[PDB]
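hi! just following up on the protien thing from before. the input was this:
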Amino acid sequence: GHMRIGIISVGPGNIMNLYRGVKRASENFEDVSIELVESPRNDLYDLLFIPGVGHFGEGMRRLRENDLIDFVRKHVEDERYVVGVCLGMQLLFEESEEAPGVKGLSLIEGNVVKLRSRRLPHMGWNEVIFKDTFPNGYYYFVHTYRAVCEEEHVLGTTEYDGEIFPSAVRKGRILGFQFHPEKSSKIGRKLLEKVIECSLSRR
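and the predicted 3d structure came back as:
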């Protein structure tokens, strides 16, 4: 009946732009609720977003400091869509060169490593070529590290300064997007729509 979207609002960085973007896209559908999450004191969400802009360690810090780790884990187990965005995508992994000792959410085996290009951070627009569900097109990036996981979990791929990296990852109902869906104009509105659309299927 009611579609329950949740966005972790604690993590480092501007989370209001994703909230506005997600709210815009959810207007095409009916009976959708979107709530900013900063604590585990809630009923599982059908669609949970782990966003964030900043340093890998800080992200895992906010998540722990606010006792949200196990909350995210329950969503994975209960088969609800969990999707990381920007920093969120990287947090889906085990380790990151950015946070030496720090361990990630480890939902997908793999590692976040620094891009090999001298010209960092990677800004501008770039082509993302998805394997199957999301719109192929140019999306807006702003990042310094990128995921390194198994071929079987790569959802979308992009090339930056001669280096091909996963701009989108996937593992069951766990989704991850490296680029900013908000700030990615039209195609970005379309991407967020497909994410809702996927969490909507009762079939």
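Residues 185-200 form the longest helix (16 residues).
The radius of gyration is 16 Å.
cheers
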